[PDB]
Amino acid sequence: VVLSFELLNAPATVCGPKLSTELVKNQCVNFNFNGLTGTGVLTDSSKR
Amino acid sequence: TCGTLSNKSPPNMTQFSSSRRGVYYPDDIFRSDVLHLTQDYFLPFNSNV
């Protein structure tokens, strides 16, 4: 079997088994959203 | 079962211009508030049609 992936800016359709944790805001944290992972401060936003 | 035709004239092939007509999004990457210069299969402007 050949699995072909794509990692677009589009809703996640298949995910790895990772457990998921509560949001932490206004603190510098590591984060991982749908495999998009980095480090920074998370806050609410005015963005649409 | 198929319908049938006769006295069907040959196509005439008269030609027109795609005046800026037919642009499309070349890839799935989301972009916003930017200018993107790209090489792809596009219908050229003022192409024969």
Ligand SMILES: *[C@@H]1O[C@H](CO)[C@@H](O)[C@H](O)[C@H]1NC(C)=O
């Ligand atoms: C068919 O083609 C001729 C020239 O080959 C052209 O004069 C004529 O207008 C065309 N038919 C139509 C309906 O435009």
Ligand SMILES: *[C@@H]1O[C@H](CO)[C@@H](O)[C@H](O)[C@H]1NC(C)=O
């Ligand atoms: C086809 O294209 C060329 C240049 O794009 C143009 O000069 C020509 O007139 C077009 N065809 C017809 C039948 O006009």
